[PDB]
Each structure stands twice: as structure tokens, then as C-alpha cells.
């Protein structure tokens, strides 16, 4: 395919343990627009993931926001996994809070 997706993973609020929050997965700079986005908790697919409408920038590259409600804990690790025609293998980016 034409262009490879970049992945950014960030929380809406400061990530306090036991406090409800939202985890964002912002996928940009990809073409064609056909894409599979998975948010992961401890390696397992999170079922309730809300997706923004797909859009594109002045450079014509596509972008989309995936977000899920989540309560951070000490030990649980989160990641965003993207499947796209531009890449042979799925691309996983880990939420970097205590990295």
C-alpha cells in the first residue's frame, strides 16, 4: 500500500490508579483508508472501543481516533494494535505511562 500508519497512545486525564479515565489511540499518515484498529489490555482485545469518523488532512493522508473508558491499575498494561496493507506485520504501540 501507499503510506504507513503512525500510532500515538495517550490518556484524556492524568492516569491515577482506581480513577476512571479514557485511553486514546490516534492513528495518522496512512493510505489506503482500509484499516483494523485494536486496543489491548494485558495482550487481550478490549470489547468497548468507540471510533471517530475517518477524516484526512491537507496532505490527503487519513486519520482516525479510537478511544475506550478504562480505570488504570499498577500492573495492567495497555497497547494499540493496527493492521494495514502498508505493513506485512501488525504494528503494536504500548501506552508509555511508567515506561
Amino acid at each position: 500500500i501507499q503510506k504507513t500508519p503512525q500510532i500515538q497512545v495517550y490518556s484524556r486525564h492524568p492516569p491515577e490508579n482506581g480513577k476512571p479515565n479514557i485511553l486514546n489511540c490516534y492513528v495518522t499518515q496512512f493510505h489506503p483508508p482500509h484499516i483494523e484498529i485494536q486496543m489491548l489490555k494485558n495482550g487481550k482485545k478490549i470489547p468497548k472501543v468507540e471510533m471517530s469518523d475517518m477524516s484526512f488532512s491537507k496532505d490527503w493522508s487519513f486519520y482516525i481516533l479510537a478511544h475506550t473508558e478504562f480505570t488504570p491499575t499498577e500492573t495492567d498494561t495497555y497497547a494499540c494494535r493496527v493492521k494495514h496493507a502498508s505493513m506485512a506485520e501488525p504494528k503494536t504501540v504500548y501506552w508509555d505511562r511508567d515506561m
Partner: protein, 271 residues
């Protein structure tokens, strides 16, 4: 003081017997409309998405777009190496003193190939030569040309003035950010990357700087503006520092919503 209105169309053709078209509309950084391939009608994503158009004026405009959507899908498969990606970006930039500039840009496989300029469709320099004849066919349709000229010169600026009145409180809304500090691994050996997170701010303009007292740490790297799901912005400003150098550093945030009272977070406040 300069609102960009953008109608984005995304059309995918996988083969002779599979295509979908989905549309989004933006006034600045706020989505005003959605139009899925699944839906017959254009969906409002704001209470003020109709602007100052009566139902009759909107139904007329919507019908014209429903005709355009079906004609476009048929005309592309008429002319048509699959798969095929076509993008359309049409709208106007509003300037002060009741001034504006309209545009209509077309991309094929993520490359800008065609625009509507003046009174006619034209291929851009470097566009595939096989487009020239289709564009001459399309330019023979004077009705379509006259309709596009009306939409770009009249309907676009008229409609957006109505959106700017109808959506004033949303467009003028002020949301205060929350900030927090963290560290991540540095690519340099003796160092760690200090991170100042700023989330929940609107509008987009913001200033985030690492400070030692009144001295700006000018190595501060401003990250990209990332969207939150609640129509607010996220940004992180980073500074790679040697172990021990963290002591006495603060992150300072300036934003319109703070009205002069900057957010100042000191690193290791609780020690």
C-alpha cells in the same frame, strides 16, 4: 478570524461490483456533519449544523448531494487497475470584512490530480495523461459547471456565515487544560525524557515550555496536536535531561481559557 470550511468525500472502489462513499464536514476543528454510505440523509453532529437555512433550503441542498453521490459512483465505474481511492475536498476559507476564497480539490490514490478553478475542471501539472479526456467530457456538462460555480461562489460563503452565527457559543467555547508531568526512556544514555502533558484545552492555540526559574529551556520539543474524543486537544512538551538535572525544572502552560493565570507544575513537588 479565519474559519476554514471543509467537506471531505472518501470513495473506495474495490471492483466493478463494490464501492462505498463516506463524507465528513469541518468548520475549523469542529465536525458539523457526517454522511455514511449506509445513510440516505446527511447527519448533523451539532445542534446548529443546518446554519440559518430553512428546512426547504436544506432539503434542496441535500437532494443535490444525494444526486451527486449516485452520479459520481456511476461516472467513476463508467470511466474505470483496482482498487481505486478518490478523495474530494471542497469548501471555503472565511476572512474578515465579509471576504472568502472557495476551493474544490480531487485526489486519486492519495495524489492531488484535479481541481475546479474559475469556470472549469482542470488536471494539475503531473496528473496522469489519461485524465485529460474524462475532464474534457466532464467540462462539456455546463449544468454541472454552473452548479459548482454557484456552490463555490454563493452557497459556501452564505452557508458558513449562517454556521458562524448559529454555532457562536461552541466556536467561542473556552476549555481549560489539566497538566501532569512524567518521564519516558531517552534515546541518549545518561538522560531521561521529561514529559509535560496538557489535555482538555480548546481552542487549539497553546504555549507549553520547560523552565528553570525565568529561563526558558529552549530545547523543549512541542509534540503534535492530538485530538481527545470530547472536542478538546492534547499536547506533550518533552525535554531530555541528565540524571540530577531534573531538580528545579517546571512546566509552564499558557492558554486563552486561563485568562493570564498560567499553569506551573514543578518536577518532584512531592519529594
Amino acid at each position: 478570524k479565519n474559519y476554514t470550511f471543509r467537506c471531505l468525500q472518501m470513495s473506495s472502489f474495490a471492483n466493478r461490483s463494490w464501492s462505498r462513499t463516506d463524507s465528513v464536514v469541518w468548520l475549523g476543528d469542529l465536525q458539523t456533519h457526517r454522511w455514511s454510505n449506509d445513510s440516505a440523509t446527511i447527519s448533523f453532529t451539532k445542534p446548529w449544523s443546518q446554519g440559518k437555512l430553512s428546512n426547504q433550503q436544506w432539503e434542496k441542498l441535500q437532494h443535490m448531494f444525494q444526486v451527486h453521490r449516485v452520479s459520481f459512483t456511476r461516472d467513476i465505474q463508467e470511466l474505470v487497475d483496482y482498487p481505486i481511492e478518490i478523495q474530494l475536498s471542497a469548501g471555503c476559507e472565511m476572512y474578515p470584512g465579509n471576504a472568502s476564497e472557495s476551493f474544490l480539490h480531487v485526489a486519486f490514490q492519495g495524489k492531488y490530480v484535479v481541481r475546479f478553478w474559475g469556470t472549469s475542471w482542470q488536471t494539475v501539472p503531473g496528473a496522469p495523461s489519461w485524465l485529460d479526456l474524462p475532464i474534457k467530457v466532464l467540462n462539456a456538462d455546463q449544468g454541472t459547471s454552473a452548479t459548482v460555480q454557484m456552490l463555490l461562489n454563493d452557497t459556501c460563503p452564505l452557508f458558513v456565515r449562517g454556521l458562524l452565527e448559529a454555532g457562536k457559543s461552541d466556536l467561542e467555547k473556552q476549555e481549560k487544560p489539566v497538566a501532569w508531568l512524567s518521564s519516558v526512556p531517552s534515546s541518549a544514555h545518561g538522560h531521561r525524557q521529561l514529559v509535560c502533558h496538557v489535555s482538555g484545552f480548546y481552542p487549539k492555540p497553546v504555549w507549553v515550555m520547560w523552565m528553570r526559574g525565568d529561563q526558558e529551556q529552549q530545547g523543549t520539543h512541542r509534540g503534535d496536536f492530538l485530538p481527545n474524543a470530547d472536542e478538546t486537544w492534547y499536547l506533550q512538551a518533552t525535554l531530555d535531561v541528565e540524571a540530577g538535572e531534573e531538580a528545579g525544572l517546571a512546566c509552564r502552560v499558557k492558554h486563552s481559557s486561563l485568562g493570564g493565570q498560567d499553569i506551573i507544575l514543578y518536577w518532584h513537588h512531592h519529594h
